[model samples]
Target chain A: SYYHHHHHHLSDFYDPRERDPSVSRRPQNRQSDEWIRELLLRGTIARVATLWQGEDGAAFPFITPLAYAYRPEQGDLVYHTNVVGRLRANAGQGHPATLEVSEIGQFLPSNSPLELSVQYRSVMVFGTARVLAGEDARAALTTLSERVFPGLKVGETTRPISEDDLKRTSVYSLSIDRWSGKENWAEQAIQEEDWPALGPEWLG
Target chain B: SYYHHHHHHLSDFYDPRERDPSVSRRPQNRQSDEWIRELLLRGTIARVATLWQGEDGAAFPFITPLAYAYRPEQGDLVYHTNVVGRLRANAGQGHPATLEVSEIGQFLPSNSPLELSVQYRSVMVFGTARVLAGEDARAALTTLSERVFPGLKVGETTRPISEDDLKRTSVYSLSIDRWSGKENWAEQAIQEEDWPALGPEWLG
Candidate 1:
C-alpha cells in the first residue's frame, strides 16, 4: 500500500514526507515507501536476513547487507556478493529472505526510568530471490553503479560487469511481498515528583 | 567455552581470541558467549525484538532499542524504556525475545554487479525477558546509571531513581539462553582491480 502510493521514478521517487514528521503527524505509524528509499540512498549499508539450513537440518537466520539496486519497474531488489559465501550458497537453495534498514536519531529520557526511549526510523521487507544473468544483469549493474557514483561520468570506473566477473560473483534479485515501517518521537511532559530522577538533565 | 578461558571480571567478559583472525578464522561460525559480549559492547545501540499478541490472538514481532546494561555474572542483560508501548506490552506478556546489535564497517565492490558487498560485525541473542519491580527494579536502575554515567558524581546532575519514578518506569531484564556473533572483513583486502573503482584519488 505504501509502495503503491509513493512509487515514482527512480531518481525522484524519494519524498520528504517520509522523512518530515510534520507531514505525517503519527511518528510511529509512518510507512511511506519514499521515506525508506531515502534511507537506502543515504545509508551506505543495510542488514540482510536469510534462512539457512544447518547440518542438523534445522533452519537458521542469517543477516548481512551489501550494495543494492532498487528497480521499481521490475519490482525487484538486487544485490551483489561473493559467489562462494554462505549467503549465496543459502540463497542459491531458493530460501526466502528479509532485509532490514535502520537509523538511530536520538535517545529521550522521561520522568521515570521506564519513560526513557529513542527516536528512530526503520524499514523491513520480505522477499524471495534468485540469481540474475546476461544483459538483464548488466542493467542491474548500471543502476548500482549510478547509485554509488551519481555525479561521476558513467563509464569512468574501470569497466562494466564482464562475463568473467559475473561468473565469479553472485547477483540475486528479490521480489518484495510484504513491508512495514515504524518510527518513534518523544515530546511529552513529565510529572513533578518523577522529574528529579527521570528528567533529561539527569542523564546528562 | 570461550568464556571460561578468558574469565576476568564482569567488564572483561569479552574474548580477544574470538576476535583474532587465525584463532577463529571462520567469520560466519563464531557462537561463543564471549564473542557475543564483544559485539554488544562494540555497538552503541541494539535492536531488541519482542513477541506481541495482536487483537486476533496471534503473536507478532516488534523491535526497539534505547540503552542497555550487560551483566555477565547475572547471566542477563538489562534495559529500560517507557511503560506503555508495543515493545513493553509485548515483553509484559511473557514472550521470548531477541536483541540484535550491529555496526557497518564498509562496502565492498565485486567483480560483477552480484559481487557488491558490505563488511560488518553483529550479534544476536535469543532470550526471555521479565519486567523488574520493587528492589530488583531499583538495583537495575542503579546498574543503568553506573553504565551510562560512569565517571560523573552521584548527585551532580539529578537524584537517583525514586520509588515513584520506578513505579512509572518499566525496567526489563533479558536472560539469554543462546546467542551468536559474526563478521565480514573480506573488504579489507585491496586488490589491483578493485583499487581504481573503490575510492577517489583524493581518498587515497
Candidate 2:
C-alpha cells in the first residue's frame, strides 16, 4: 500500500550536506541535467565572481549580481554589461570564474542545534568566460530582453532593441564545464515515531 | 509648487551607473551608514566570493552563498560553516574578499530595455576574514541562533548551543573596510509624460 501510494517519505533523508564531490546528499536523487537547465532558464539573475590580481601577484575576488539568462542551445550562461568595467576586463582575458543562483524558502528546525536548517535551491557553475561578438552577442542579448519584457508583442511594447544598444553593450558567456547543485525542500529533516514535529514558532 | 514640492524627475541619472570610488545611486538619496548597518543586522544571507590563485599567477575566483549577519559593535560580517571546504581554505589565508547582501523587489519594465529596472536594496562589503575561536566564536554563534529562532526560550522547545558545538564549528568574521550601497524604488524609471509604461504582464 505504501509503494502504491507514491507519496513515500524519503527512503532515507538526513541533513543534505554531502562531503563527496561525486555524491548527492539527503534524498540523494540529484536533479537531472534537464532539471538543472530548467532552473537556469527560469532565473532572471545570477551572481558572477572573478579574480583581480595585484602587482604583488596577490589575487582578490570581486562579485557582481547582474541580469542573466541560460542559453540552452549554446550550453552557456550569458549576461551583458557596460563595454568597459572590471567584469568586461576579466571576460576579455577569459579568466576562470564561478556563477551562482539561488532561491531561499522555508526554515526547517530540529531539536539539535546542529540540525537547524532552511530550504533553498542553489546551483554553482565553474567555467571561464569570454566576450561575445557578432551573432553570438546578439543571441545572448535577445534572451535577456525576452526575460525582461516577457510576452511583449513586437511594437505592442514601445519597440524592440535597437542596433545602437548592442553597440554600447558587452555580452559575455561562460562555457560551463562543471556544475553542482544542492537543494533541501523537505518539510523537516527526518521522520521518526518518537520525534514530534518542531513547533510553528521555531519554523519562522 | 513643483519646485516647492521638491519632487522632481531624474534628469542626471545616467542609467544609475557610477564611475566614482565613492558615490550613491538611489532614488538619489540611497542609504546612510546607519541604514546600511540596519539592513546587515536583519539580513539572513549574503554571498561571499574568494579566489584561489594558480601557480603561474593565474587568479581563479570562487563564490559561496551562505547565511550571514553583521555585528555593528565589532564591525564584522559573521557566518558559521564547517572547518573545511573552499570557503575555509580561502579564509585561512586571510585573503581580501567581498560580501554582498541584496533584496530584490518588483520588476519594472520600460520602453527602453536598457532603462528597464527593478526595486532593490543592496549593500557591498570589502573585507578580509579569519576563523574565530573561544568566547568570540560563541558570541558569533549565539547571534545566528537568535536570528533563526527569535525570542526562543532556552531549554524550552529545544536546547541552546552547547560547548561541544563550538569545538567542532568554524565561525568566520570578515573585518569590513570600505562598503557601498545602491538602490532603486521608483515603482518605474523616470516619471516623464513621454515615456510609455510597460504592460502589466512584465511587471512580475
Candidate 3:
C-alpha cells in the first residue's frame, strides 16, 4: 500500500500532505531498480525489526543484526536463528517485520547541523514473516549458506544441512509487501544559501 | 523491565524455560558495561526501530538508519530528522522504540551451516521517544554536532544552532529503559562434536 501510492503518483510530490514522508523528499537520491537488486545480491548482513507482542497486548519493538540471504527473483528474504528465540518466536507468527540493509559512507561537512549528512545506500523491505519448515526450510538454508560461503562445495567445505541441525535452527522467510531503496552518494552536503560558507579548514 | 530480569539473574542461564531468550545464551560473549559505554560514545550511526500506528489500530514496524549521539550519563540517545516524517511522527508520540548499534566482523567457516557465524559486537537500547523543543532541542543538536565533528569549533568550523535551523528540524531523545550488549570475536566457529573435522582446504 505504501509503495503503490508513492510510486505511481508523481503529482503528489508537490503536496506534503499527499506525500509519504518516509519516501525521500529529494527525488534525485531515489535509487534505480537495478541498483537495489545489486545491493541485495551483494549484501550479507541486515538489521531486522519486529514487534514482540505480550499476552497483555502490549508490543515492544525489537531489532537485531543477522546474516541474511536475499532472493531477488521472489522478492523474499531468509535468515536463520536459534530455534526458540525472540527473533524466531516473534517473526514466525506472521507478524509484520522490516529488514534494512545499508552501506554507510563518508560524513560530509556542512555549515549547519541540519545540512550535515552522509553518503549512504539503504533499502528497506517490509513484510510478514513465517517460519519455514521441511523442504522449504532446507532450500532457504541452502540459499543462505551459498550466499555466505559463495563457492564452498556443500560436501567438501561443509556438510549437508542435517535433520539435527534443522532441529536446532529456525529459518524464516519474509514475504515482501513493499520495498523502497534510497541512495545519497553526493560528494558533499548541500550548502545553506543563507548561512556563511564553511572554510577550507572545515572541509578537510 | 527487560533489563531488570535479565541483569539480576545469573542462575537462570541454566534453565531454558527461565531464560530470557533475547539475552545472549553464551555468557562469554556478553560485553562489560564499560565496553558498551565506550561503543555508545564512539559510534556514529544507529538503526532505530519504532511502530507506526494507523487510524484503523493496526501497526507496522518501521526502521531507519540515523546518526545519533549517545549520552552515557543520562542513558539517552539524541538524533535529528525532518520536521515532519515517519520517524518524527511515529517516535514523537510517546511510542516505544529500539536503537541498535553494531559492528560486523569477518565471517567464520564451519563444517555445518548451523555453525557458520561471524565476529560481531552489537548493542540494543529499548525505550520511549519524545520530541524535544526550545533549548532542549538546541542542546540535543549541539551534542549531536560536537560528536559528529569532534574537534570542529562552532564559531570557526560551523555556525551556532540558530532558531531558524531549529524550526526546520526535529530532535528526539530516547530515554532508555533497558539495554543489552553482546560481542563475539572468536577466531573460528566452535566445532560440532558429531560432525567430521573440517580439513585445511576448508579452512582457507
Candidate 4:
C-alpha cells in the first residue's frame, strides 16, 4: 500500500559548508556531522512532535520522545510504538511527519539592553514514515535496543517479541528526505564599558 | 473574528502526572494559572512554533521566541513581532498555533547501558492566536518589554518602542484554551541490569 501521490517533493535549503559561521562557534554546532553521529552513538532519547488533522481539518501538534534507531545508510530514522496511538494511526493512514531533536546551550546574559537572547542547537527531520514488520521489525528492534543501551548483553533476558507485543507495537521509519540544523551564538562582542561590574568587596 | 471549537477534547490520558514519576514529577498535571504566573515570574523567554501550509499544501513548522506580556485579568498571553514573517502571516490567517516554553534543568548520564536522558520542566500552550492593535498593542508592548527585561531604565539609548516601531510591528495575543506542563525529575529509574555497560568513559 505504498502511496506515491501522498509524498511531497521537499525543497532543500540546507548547505553544510555554506552554513552561517556564527553557528560554528556554538559548542553543540561546531562539528555538525560529529554532533549527529554522537546522538546516534549515545542514543539519547529525543523529543518528537507530530502534527495531525483534527476533526475540522485543523492541525494538532503532539509532542513526545521515544526510543529510536538511526541508520545513516538508510538515510532515515526509525522508531516503534503501538500501532494504535494517534501518531502511528495517522501515519499508517498516510500523513507526513516532522521529527525534531534539540539540545539547549548556555543562556548568555547580555549587557546590551536590546540584545538579550538564548543560544540553542536543534535538528529537524521532515519526511513521510512507513511501517516495517516481520524480519525487518526484529532487526530494527535489535538496533534500537543496542543503540539505546550500547554494549549491553540483552541476551535471552530480552526474549524475542511476543505476538501480543508485535500486534500492539507500531514500527515506523521516517525516510530522511531532508533535514536542517539551526543554532545561535554570540557573534558580536560586548564593549568593555558595557560590562557588568563586580563590587570591590565581592572581588575580595 | 474569533472561532472556538473543542473537537477531539484532548483526553486527559496524556496526563503528564501519570507518566514516570521520576521523569515527570511536576505537581501540576496541566498548565494551570499558577504555572503561567511562575513562568512569568522567572522571566524566561518563550519559543512559539507555528504550523503553516506551504504553497504546495505541504505543512511546515516555524519557530521563534517572542517577548511576552502575560495578563491574568485578560486571561491571555500577549507578544509583539514584526508584521512580516511566516508566523504572523499564518496566524493572521486563522491557523492554530502551539507555543512552548521550557526551563532546562540538567542532562543526566546513565550509569548503566541505558540511553542518556535529561531532567527538565516545560510548558506547552495550545491556543488560538489573533492580532491585537490600537490601545491593546501599546499596553501589551509596554508590559512585554518591562516583564522580559526587568529593572531596565528607558533611556535615550534604550528607549521604549516608538510609534513607528509599533506601527511596523504586529501585536498578537494567545488566549488560554488548553495547556499542559511536563517535568522530568530524578526518579523512576530504568532497570538495565541485563544490558552491557558502555562504561562512564564514553559519556561526555
The best candidate in terms of lDDT: 3
Best by DockQ: 2
**lDDT (tens digit, per residue) of candidate 2 on A24-94:** 54453356666577778788878888666543455566677778888777778888865233333253568
Error of 4 at A82 (Å): 6.5
lDDT digits (tens) for residues B81-129 of candidate 1: 6523343323244546567777766555433343344566778777778
Quality class of the docking in candidate 3, CAPRI style: acceptable
Per-residue accuracy of model 3 over B150-181 as CA lDDT, tens digit each: 77555456667788988888789999987778
lDDT of 4 by residue, A1-204 (tens): 123324433212353345555555644334476665555545455545566565556566655556676788887777874423243224355456666666554443334333434455666667777777776765676677666655533343343444555565667777776665655555432322333432233222
Docking class of 4: incorrect
CA shift of B191, model 1, Å = 2.2
Share of reference contacts found in each model:
0.06, 0.66, 0.71, 0.03
lDDT of 2 at A134: 73
Error of 1 at B12 (Å): 40
lDDT tens digits, residue span B73-160, model 4: 7877787655233433243545566777666544444433233444566777777777777777767766665566555433322444
iRMSD (1 decimal) for each model? 5.0, 3.0, 2.2, 5.8
Off by over 4 Å in 2: A1-31, A54-57, A83-92, A153-156, A189-200, B1-31, B53-58, B83-93, B153-157, B190-197, B200-204
* Every model: Cα RMSD to truth: 14.4, 8.6, 11.8, 15.3
Best-performing candidate as measured by TM-score: 3
Predicted chain B of candidate 3, TM-score versus the true chain B? 0.74
Worst 10 residues of 4 chain B by lDDT: B1-10
Docking class of 1: incorrect
Better of 2 and 3 by lDDT: 3
TM-score of chain A of each: 0.70, 0.70, 0.75, 0.65
